[PDB]
């Protein structure tokens, strides 16, 4: 219940990473009901975004940083389920449901 101490090693940290991913995935049906996503996105797409998020941070080697990321993820998930801030194609911070990029940026504005 209380905030646990900082992880000793990457095995402890990974056990915690797996525990969080399990909790995040198990709440997916609750989210789908709250935001009425039955005709917007698939539950696996929600799972992919969560596992993606975790895979983008696979280069972290410091267990303290991993603990902070897990804590922030747990906080973010709790808000999404309890205090939903509904936006159409957006759940929290996740978008749900012949020329190079330079010329597009050039056409848009002078600030890239």
Q: Which is nearer to other proteins, 11 or 78 (CB)?
A: 78
Among residues 82 and 101, whose Cβ is nearest to other proteins? 82
We find the least distance from the C-beta atom of residue 52 to other proteins, in angstroms, to be 19
Residue 65 CB, nearest approach to other proteins (Å): 6
Contact footprint for other proteins (CB under 8 A): 1-6, 36, 39-40, 62, 64-65, 67-68, 71, 75-76, 78-80, 82-83, 85-88, 92-93, 97
Shortest Cβ 61–other proteins spacing (Å): 13
Pair 63, 13: CB distance under 8 Å? yes
Tokens for 9, please give them. 């090693």
Q: Least separation, in Å, of the C-beta of 58 and other proteins?
A: 18
Contact 81, 26 (CB under 8 A): no
Contact partners, residue 107, CB within 8 Å, separation at least 6 = none
For residue 25, the number of C-alpha atoms closer than 13 Å in the C-beta half-sphere is 16
8 A C-beta contact, residue 79 and residue 53 = no
């Amino acid at each position: 219940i209380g905030v646990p101490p900082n992880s000793a090693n990457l095995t402890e940290a990974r056990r915690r990473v797996f525990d969080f991913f399990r909790a995040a995935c198990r709440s997916i049906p609750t989210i789908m009901d709250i935001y009425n996503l039955q005709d917007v996105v698939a539950p696996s797409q929600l799972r992919y975004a969560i596992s993606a998020q975790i895979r983008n941070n696979a280069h972290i080697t410091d267990p303290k940083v991993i603990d902070l990321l897990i804590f922030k993820g747990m906080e973010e998930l709790t808000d999404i389920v309890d205090h939903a801030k509904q936006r159409h194609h957006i759940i929290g911070q996740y978008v749900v449901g012949g020329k190079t990029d330079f010329l597009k940026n050039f056409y848009t504005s002078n600030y890239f």
